[PDB]
From a paper:
The Ring finger domain structure was refined in space group P1, with eight molecules per asymmetric unit. The Ring finger domain of hMEX‐3C forms stable dimer in solution as determined using size exclusion chromatography method. The core Ring finger domain adopts the typical Ring fold, consisting of two antiparallel β‐strands (β1 from Residues 618–621, and β2 from Residues 652–656) and one central α helix (α1 from Residues 630–638) [Fig. 1(b)]. It suggests that the two Zn2+ ions are very important to maintain the stability of the intact Ring finger domain structure and contribute to its E3 ligase activity. The cysteines/histidine (1st, 2nd, 5th, 6th) coordinate one cation and others (3rd, 4th, 7th, 8th) coordinate the second cation. Moreover, to analyze the roles of predicted interface residues, we mutated them to alanine, respectively. In the self‐ubiquitination assays, mutants of I610A, I636A, P645A, and Q648A abolished activity, while V609A and K639A reduced activity [Fig. 3(b)].
Ubiquitination of Lys‐63 linked ubiquitin chains to RIG‐I by hMEX‐3C in stress granules is important for the activation of the IFNB promoter and RIG‐I‐mediated antiviral innate immunity. Ring finger domain is responsible for the ubiquitination reaction and defines the largest family of E3 ligases.
Residue numbers in the entry:
A (entry chain B), B (entry chain A): 605 to 659
The structure:
């Protein structure tokens, strides 16, 4: 429950659109979204939104 | 290992946007988007795209 690759504190629950990388908690994903130039920190693809993943 | 909830034949690979339901193979998710009133079969939310999820 500590597997977010950004903060390593929260649980992974979010994926970025459209690259689909599912490696982030929602707080870190939201922070990615309101950067000046939102982009995936892993693959650098531009980010248009973050979604919570439901499996 | 998870089975697509539509066909129960292929692995789960894709999620719908924006509801984030991650329960579909890419073929079944593509079929969802290509319909004329696209909506998630699980929660009935309108679907604006389907993406492959990378975990
Ligand atoms: Zn985080
Ligand atoms: Zn990415
Ligand atoms: Zn399927
Ligand atoms: Zn849904």
């Amino acid at each position: 429950k500590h597997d977010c690759v950004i903060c390593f504190e929260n649980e992974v629950i979010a994926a970025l659109v459209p690259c689909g990388h599912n490696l982030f908690c929602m707080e870190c994903a939201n922070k990615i979204c309101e950067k000046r130039t939102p982009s995936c920190p892993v693959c650098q693809t531009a980010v248009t939104q973050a979604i919570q993943i439901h499996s």
